[PDB]
Amino acid sequence: VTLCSPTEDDWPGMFLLAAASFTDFIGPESATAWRTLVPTDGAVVVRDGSEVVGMALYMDLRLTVPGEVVLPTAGLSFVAVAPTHRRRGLLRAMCAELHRRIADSGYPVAALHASEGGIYGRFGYGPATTLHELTVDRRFARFHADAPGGGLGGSSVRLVRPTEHRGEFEAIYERWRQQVPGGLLRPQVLWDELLAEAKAAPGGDRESFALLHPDGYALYRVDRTDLKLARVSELRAVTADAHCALWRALIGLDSMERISIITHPQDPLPHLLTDTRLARTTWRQDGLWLRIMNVPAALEARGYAHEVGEFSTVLEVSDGGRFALKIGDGRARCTPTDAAAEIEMDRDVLGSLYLGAHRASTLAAANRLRTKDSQLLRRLDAAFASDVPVQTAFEF
């Protein structure tokens, strides 16, 4: 059992383990595009000796955090352990090697999407975004008198074929991802993959349509089996007007009984309707997970709420140092100290606070972060809150 960077000769063993580990992995063409995002030395394999029994890698991503700050981010992906090689510490060894490489390379954060909720907390990843599925019974849906774009005259929204408006989608998404915490840069090769998945599949997904506004798009397809359900795969709106105009068009899908979307907890959709209850939360789950690799670099990089007055404290991360933390005028300074800790928490907890998806008060009540000062808790809650609701860009 060696742990090595793979050679070109290891990739067929990796594609077999991938096919056996992930139902979405059709074959080598499935990894082509993603693989242009893996740097040299971004991948490890475990061999028996020899055949591939374990693999993991990271992609070079750009993640938007509160204050519209974009961080270089190591996106852990393609992590699999052969069903023959369970319980042999292979995931631990692969994550320790990649974390060493990611830290040495200068990434301040790593990120992933978790197949299960119980695996990555012990490696320092905290869930940092929340997926919220809304299902609208569009047959009862009426827009509130206050809702934007109720005026008579031309619609600002067009129904279009996705592949014919790639430039517009790219430009709208680039604006969206730079203004929203959770935003990811989407490289050309991932736009190629997204547009390929928009075509009908022989006995698979139905054809995707787009609704296009100058300041937003929705990409939607009818469910393969439930022919009265439209699933909105993606909806990116840069203005409130674009968001409302797109939902007026989706609620105009008169063939459908139900429109479903995976969105975030602060989606204003329900408030656009005379009956907020028509926007049923049908599913909730963790989205993006974060591991803070460098505590001071990460805490100083993000912007903080201007509404909390200057304060200083001492934060200890369980295996990640102790720091004098001063937050004022929306900026943090975070410097080494041996002064007594006023706040303690594990690395994963800081990841869960970092984008504003989880309140410090909520984690304190679970004893995941410890402090004897209730005032300090309220100040942390207020300071780490994000003005712009955190959203989830796209899985990887």
Added chain:
Amino acid sequence: VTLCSPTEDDWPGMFLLAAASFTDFIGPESATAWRTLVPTDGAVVVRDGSEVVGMALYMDLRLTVPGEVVLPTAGLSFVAVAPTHRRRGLLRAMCAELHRRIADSGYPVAALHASEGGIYGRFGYGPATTLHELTVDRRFARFHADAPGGGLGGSSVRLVRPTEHRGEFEAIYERWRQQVPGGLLRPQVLWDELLAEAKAAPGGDRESFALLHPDGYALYRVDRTDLKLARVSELRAVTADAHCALWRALIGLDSMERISIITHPQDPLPHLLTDTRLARTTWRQDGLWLRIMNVPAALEARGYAHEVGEFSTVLEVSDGGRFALKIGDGRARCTPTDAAAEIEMDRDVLGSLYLGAHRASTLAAANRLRTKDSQLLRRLDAAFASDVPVQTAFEF
């Protein structure tokens, strides 16, 4: 079609309309207890002429709002319109009469639980608490190393018969309701009803058990049909330790596959587990709805977040006045003005902000409140936030 306060002679017609309108209304004994909470002149009936074709009433309640302030609250309840008398403006007429009586009597707020989401917004009620159902697959549930009360030795929690510990439940609930926004005083007659519903029913609900801690209780019963589901009807914990100790005991129900509870969005339960995902959000809905009857009395009564610096603005409520609003040191002053409005919203929107369940930013993005100042929005969001998460006491 007259609208009158009912006489003793009207109540049998009211019990018939009740039985036909609400599946939970077994008969007159169903209204006995609740009815001690209806003041003189708290009830209206509509007669055809004569028989009862419409009814509505309010109960005298005490509602806890942020800052642990308790307001006299008119709880609208028993609102029904005969299926023969639909679309005749009877609900509008009954709500206008009760609102006149409630305002003249000096209540600063009214409240209700809505049978449907599309009815009460137009009468000025906004949804103000959020019910969140969590279903735990307790067979996988393990407590995080950080979770309180993991030590060996005696359990602080006892399994008890509800009717034998009424005094302890009352005392714990009284402490809970005074510290949590959404808390309601629960009078003796509602404790009598709650303890009666704890007994097994011939071909109905199974027997209720209690888990009792010095600082919390849970009341739970196995589902009538799904014998592997335990439903926690109520869980009131005054400390984090009590909340964790009670959940350790509920996860010790080894007969069960699943524990379900109707809780609030900030329930720390998920964070107590090594897998946060085991705490599935299976259902979300509006809980308590508020109508602000007197804008200045309500805005001055509640406490505001100390973390936002002093600010002044001009708020117009659509049919509810215009006010100079100054918020600093956790207190608001709210005085008449004809100065230009900086913020506008309908009455229902203010009700939805009032307990901190909905952010001003979220309602602004839906255009339910209008302002041209993004700084003012962030300040409102921060000021109206509740330190203690808003919860739902009990339906009425």
Added chain:
Amino acid sequence: VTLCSPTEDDWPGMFLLAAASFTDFIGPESATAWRTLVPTDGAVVVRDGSEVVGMALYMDLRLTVPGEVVLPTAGLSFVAVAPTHRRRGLLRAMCAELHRRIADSGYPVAALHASEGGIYGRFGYGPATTLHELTVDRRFARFHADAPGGGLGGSSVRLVRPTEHRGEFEAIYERWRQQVPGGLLRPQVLWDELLAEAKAAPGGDRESFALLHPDGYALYRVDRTDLKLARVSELRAVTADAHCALWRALIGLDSMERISIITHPQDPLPHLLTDTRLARTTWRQDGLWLRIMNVPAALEARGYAHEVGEFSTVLEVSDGGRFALKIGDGRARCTPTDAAAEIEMDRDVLGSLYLGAHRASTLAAANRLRTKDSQLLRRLDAAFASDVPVQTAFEF
């Protein structure tokens, strides 16, 4: 194995066989009321020797046929064969004895409700009414501009407790049953049973309500498990206005998603709505079955359509005689003949034609009645049609 009229001593053995044969038979009190309708000599039992292994009986009923003619009718009921005594010709022997007694007593017709569709055709019973279940999604239901009773002002319909308006229900039903083919006289003891079943049952059916109009009533109850379904057990309307007024009230049950009723194929309900499709046929089945005991007495008793000109033919019933049949001015004369048959059919087929539920043309296409004259077929179709749609009164 003797076949005898039962003595008082046989009835406990009969109640045991009943309880084991019919899930609805709670105990002796279940047969008390019905049993006042069984004449002396209306019952047979088969004993092993001794214990009751077979039973059958008939009740004295009054059945309305086209032309508003009321016939004395033998209602076969309480027919059971012990599961130990299957395939021993016991049903055949019991039906031959009762048919002899019914014929000798002077009944022109027998009738029953069939537990299964494959049993009674061979004993000469044809299905003669059609049960049609309509389920309305009342949330979309809007009344057509043409629909009666759309005017503003008092409703002619009242919501009432069934037991307090027994006199009105009785009078409306008596008018209904005399004007509709399929109508049955409902004696006092069956009104006692109907009103008893209207009360809530400990872990059984929910309480029944009534909607009362001067010229119609509906009796409805919410489903025991599906709390958004109202089931209309009975709806008797003497005028079109009463039928429309009652459906406006049922569609005013705003708590409900769906209203279901067992009605007949010509129920005008769908045509009252702007969307006829909201009235989904969810179930169809045979209702009342008829055996014509005396062919000439039955054919001369009913009225025929005035719109077909006088015609004469020769009808042979397979074991029931050959007859010169002359139909004109809405009356038939039906006299013995040995002239060549122009129409042939079995006894059950005549029962299926007799109330107008089945067309002669439809039965001819299945070869259940044979004729070489297509003109004679059209004339029979037209003559046996019922002006007033055939309905089903109540099961027995």
Added chain:
Amino acid sequence: VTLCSPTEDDWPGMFLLAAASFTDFIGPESATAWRTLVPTDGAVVVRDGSEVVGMALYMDLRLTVPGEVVLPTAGLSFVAVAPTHRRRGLLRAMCAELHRRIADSGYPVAALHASEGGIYGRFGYGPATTLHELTVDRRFARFHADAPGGGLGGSSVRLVRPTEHRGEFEAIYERWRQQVPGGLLRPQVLWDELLAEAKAAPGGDRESFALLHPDGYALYRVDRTDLKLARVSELRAVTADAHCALWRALIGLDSMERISIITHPQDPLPHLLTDTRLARTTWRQDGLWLRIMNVPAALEARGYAHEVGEFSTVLEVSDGGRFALKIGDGRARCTPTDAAAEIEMDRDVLGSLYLGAHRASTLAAANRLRTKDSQLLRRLDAAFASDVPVQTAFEF
């Protein structure tokens, strides 16, 4: 927003709107065949300005009505409104333009299949045929002793590959469509489409088989997911013997538990079995909708029942003229008059009467047609009845 006949350049915008509006529309090849049936000027588009936001067209069809009379019929089809352009009166404008063109061209009737039941009544279309799904549990099915073709010896029915017997299917269907009200001429291009859909589809429908008799065929395929269900897509029988012989063969599909077919309410199938109840009505819905474009041309074209004696009345269609209507010897004369109306109804109601699927008495009880004469009602019922049951040919 212009409304224009489309140019060749408009058809790609029309195919996109089609793909987004109808799940069955795979792509341009889906409209090729149908489109040979659209005359010059048979199509309208609505453009924003430009892109296609609305479309509708009619095909040249031949519809059989009672008396075996074949009418030129405008079949409205391909009607779609972009989800972005809802509630802008686009369907009303398109239907008014096509109705003007259809009337000017000399069609006496228009027809369509409705996506929803609440849309087309207001444009004068009444539902005129009734789809009736029968599901047979073929494991219990036994043919009645009376049923044709029970004799020993060769079967008159063969199991065949559809594509190898196109000539026989065409000839049988041509005979069927000329003798049955609801029959449509099926042009060569629709036989090409039907035979293409008979082949297995990669992850779609299973292969179709045929059962072939000299005087009838059935085309059936096993359900894609329920492998014990055979769905009969089409069954066309010119004689009762052919209908019975085909059902004996379908009930010989010993692999299957259930045979389902979409048929008409007078299908004799149930009467062929010893248990009529084995033929469960599992679904009922409107089929073909009719708009009478020229009242006198339509009323004079169809044949009427010979069994009703000569009568005269005055019929007013709400926006369609008033007429002296005389019906005798199976023929109507229908001439302009200003004499007082004895019968009134909207245009859609006449469409619903026209093929005999709905009785005048049933529509009168819903107040959809008004008369003060009950004798006149019975005469209309009898006169508009169809000797041959109305059936549905094929959707368009």
